[PDB]
Amino acid sequence: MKQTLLLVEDDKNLADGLLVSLEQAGYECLHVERIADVEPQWKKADLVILDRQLPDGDSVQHLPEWKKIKDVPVILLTALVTVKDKVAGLDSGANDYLTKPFAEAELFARIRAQLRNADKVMTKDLEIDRATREVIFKGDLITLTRTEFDLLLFLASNLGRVFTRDELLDHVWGYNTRTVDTHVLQLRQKLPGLEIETLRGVGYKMKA
Amino acid sequence: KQTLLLVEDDKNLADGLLVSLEQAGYECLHVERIADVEPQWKKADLVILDRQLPDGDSVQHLPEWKKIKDVPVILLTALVTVKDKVAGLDSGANDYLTKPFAEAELFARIRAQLRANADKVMTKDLEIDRATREVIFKGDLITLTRTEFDLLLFLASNLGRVFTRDELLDHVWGYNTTRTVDTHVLQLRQKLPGLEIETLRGVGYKMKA
Amino acid sequence: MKQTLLLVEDDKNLADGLLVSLEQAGYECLHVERIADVEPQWKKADLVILDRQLPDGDSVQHLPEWKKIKDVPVILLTALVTVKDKVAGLDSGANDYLTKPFAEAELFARIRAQLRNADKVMTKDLEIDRATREVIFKGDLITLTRTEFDLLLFLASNLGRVFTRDELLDHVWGYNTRTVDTHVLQLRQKLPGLEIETLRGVGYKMKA
Amino acid sequence: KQTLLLVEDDKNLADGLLVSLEQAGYECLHVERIADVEPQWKKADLVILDRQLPDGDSVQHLPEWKKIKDVPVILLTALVTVKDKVAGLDSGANDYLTKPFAEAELFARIRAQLRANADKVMTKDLEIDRATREVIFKGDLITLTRTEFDLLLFLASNLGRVFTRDELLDHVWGYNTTRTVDTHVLQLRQKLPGLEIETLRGVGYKMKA
DNA sequence: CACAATTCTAATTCTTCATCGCTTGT
DNA sequence: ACAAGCGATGAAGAATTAGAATTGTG
């Protein structure tokens, strides 16, 4: 019961308030205010909420080439009026729509219904299927726990990315110190040929 | 090719919208009552429902239909109340419309939900039949309750797909009680011997084969 | 030990969805749109939410006589952001203020903060404290269940009120048929001398 | 008679605000560091706290301060994001205010929080010492783990009252996982035989005394 | 009265935390 | 070599599935 999430919005306290309810909801969040920054986080993202009027042009015009990267449930949430925009937003690749002042439970409903190969995460000699929660290393499946599988998968999708151990507490356990090492050592000592290059202070990324 | 379906008792606008939809390329199906929905649900690849039909409300019968063919169910009604948009979409509904609608708004929500036998299952061990609502494990006709008959069917459709106990009370029961499922499988190990249901610590339950 | 709630807002959509994620939350709600309609819904409540934009005048000018009845946590929220209005809203009896745009979680945080003699609701030969959930009837103490005690004190606060059998179901059972009859019998058969006057195939009511 | 307190390292702004309260008449205290924030917590009927402090954060140590006296508190900080606002309010706060503010705004929020031996307790058969974390239950000396002492602590504080297991996790354990309390009382019947703990099937637990 | 959800309850599978010692660069 | 930091060690305290009569109920 855990997936990923993305956000795009320039509004300040409304993009802030929404991302509090979702981190209280249990879906990890990425927040962006520049189309120049949406290319990095797209592959990481399984879902996208968007706004229409923004810097670097109208976002819907920059949309379809990101759809071309991944078939991702994309919802344009924005203040605008015409049904012409509804056709403008949904003739292209898109899978719903909303509008202006709204209630936050409305958005939570339209995205909950959309939640219900691409399901794999392949890196180097490793197949991770979360529909079964099984890992394979050179044709060998080793069973892990819900927390061991969590940290490994977050770094099975994030390649070459380093985050801090305090950040790993709030990214593997969800919203609310030395376990990070004694269990990544549970991983090294139980997965022969583990390719996690330890670092100093700041610590963990996956080369490939 | 492409097929669809619709359910509407109001005559003038329904007849006219399927005309423009028959003018459109799609081949069209239509009924006026809920007893006629289950006949052609299968051959249809997309449906259009309403909340105010003659023979009752369409949501109470919905989730059984998505478990014969999971096709995009687009609700359409005069109920602009947001609590319907909640009960609808948190039942097996994808999207809504407004009671009057722009025609190109409707189609745009048809393509957007199109671009992105069925009664018999074949578990290597045994056989399940949803018509007679029974089970045959190596010849034995096991006696189950509806609760324990229903949780096995949603799992036999997605075997090997482990899911948490919180995402099953929203899938066997109605969406939106208590903490129970641990005892509902314990009875199925008690009466179906050697049934491959692996239990994971802190994760969930799943069927391997 | 769940409790009550109340709402005063003429704006319909933002009062529509606001009560959704509260019914999703687990507190029953009351929906008002006139100050002449605010008077009757007060005593039954531990909490009160209020708007300053109302038909039939300024809501703060009808405020202290509601404080007289019960000292209730009554937040305010409006398009009036002036600290002068904050002094107006808070010199008089209240506990908080807010702003038109928010996270729905801000209210949720600012209502969980207020929850923590008046615990009782007392009727004919009946003493019901919700903090212990024992019934005292003519002096006798008698056991109940989770739902038995919940519907008994439901009709204990509501004097002479009548809800339909379907209305009693969604109220005492989780959101989103014959038991209402058989359980009110497990109420009569438990305690004799209970003024549940059955009506015409319709509803039920506790008179006094 | 009416007392209150303040916590801030900022020098002149704190000086001008406590003088206004002394101009307001409310007898007040002030501490500049967390080193002495704990001593004078008892004498105050209200506390104004700032998280921006040189010797660390304040919310990370908030709940044990309220756990000694349930007096309302207010947070004042340069962190005006809603994620900081809800985090403080959910971790035991009682109100909130922005960083740059007017005076009567504070005052009106001082009265609004005013108009509506705390270390040892003695109950039947239990004579509890919270400082040394020891209990003498029926003549014997009992010593168990920490969480099993904070659990019999908030119950020993609000005893005779029931609380659902959901309302204990955010009240005894760290908020800002269900099969636990069902087992945490079990060993309380193993180590404290004869404890006066009734249970409510479907509801929470309580101490009968 | 049948059916179902509760509390035990009993025996494990996992986090977290000190301690030595060990891996990086300073 | 020194000086922070990072393997490892292996526990002990949390969770985590399994039975039995009880309780509640649509």
Author numbering:
A (entry chain B), C (entry chain D): 1 to 116, 125 to 184, 189 to 220
B (entry chain A), D (entry chain C): 2 to 117, 125 to 184, 188 to 220
What's the publication's text?
The response regulator VbrR from Vibrio parahaemolyticus, a member of the OmpR/PhoB family, regulates virulence and antibiotic resistance genes. VbrR is a member of the OmpR/PhoB family and contains an N-terminal receiver domain (RD) and a C-terminal DNA-binding domain (DBD), connected by a flexible linker, and can directly bind with the promoter region of exsC to mediate its downregulation. The VbrK/VbrR TCS is activated by host-derived nitrite during infection, which leads to the downregulation of Type-3 secretion system-1 (T3SS1) via repression of its positive regulator exsC for maximal virulence. In the cell or solution, VbrR proteins exist mainly as inhibitory dimers formed through the DBD, and phosphorylation of RDs allows the formation of RD dimers, which in turn changes the conformation of the DBD from an inhibitory state to an active state.
To gain insights into the DNA binding mode of VbrR, we cocrystallized the monomeric VbrR and DNA fragments of various lengths within the 30 bp fragment, with either blunting ends or overhangs of one or two bases. Crystals of VbrR in complex with a blunt-ended 26 bp DNA fragment were obtained, and the resulting structure of the VbrR-DNA complex was determined to 4.6 Å resolution to allow for the denotation of the secondary structure elements of the RD and DBD domains. Eight molecules, corresponding to four VbrR dimers and two DNA fragments, were modelled in the asymmetric unit. Two dimers (complex-1 and complex-3) bind with DNA fragments in the forward direction, while the other two (complex-2 and complex-4) bind with DNA fragments in the reverse direction, which may be due to crystal packing. We focused on complex-1, which represents the active conformation of VbrR dimer binding with exsC promoter DNA, to analyze structural details. In the VbrR-DNA structure, each VbrR protomer contains one RD and one DBD, connected by a disordered linker. The two RDs form a symmetric head-to-head dimer using the α 4-β 5-α 5 interface, and the two DBDs form a head-to-tail dimer and bind with DNA half-sites S1 (TTCTAAT) and S2 (TTCATCG), respectively. In protomer A, the interaction surface involves α2-α4 from the RD domain and β7-β8 loop, α6, and α7-α8 loop from the DBD domain, whereas it involves α1’, α1’-β2’ loop, and α2’ from the RD domain and α6’, α7’, α7’-α8’ loop from the DBD domain in protomer B. Each DBD places its recognition helix-α8/α8’ into the DNA major groove, where it recognizes 7 bp of promoter DNA, and the C-terminus of α6/α6’ also involves DNA binding. In addition, the β-hairpin connecting β9-β10/β9’-β10’ dips into the DNA minor groove.
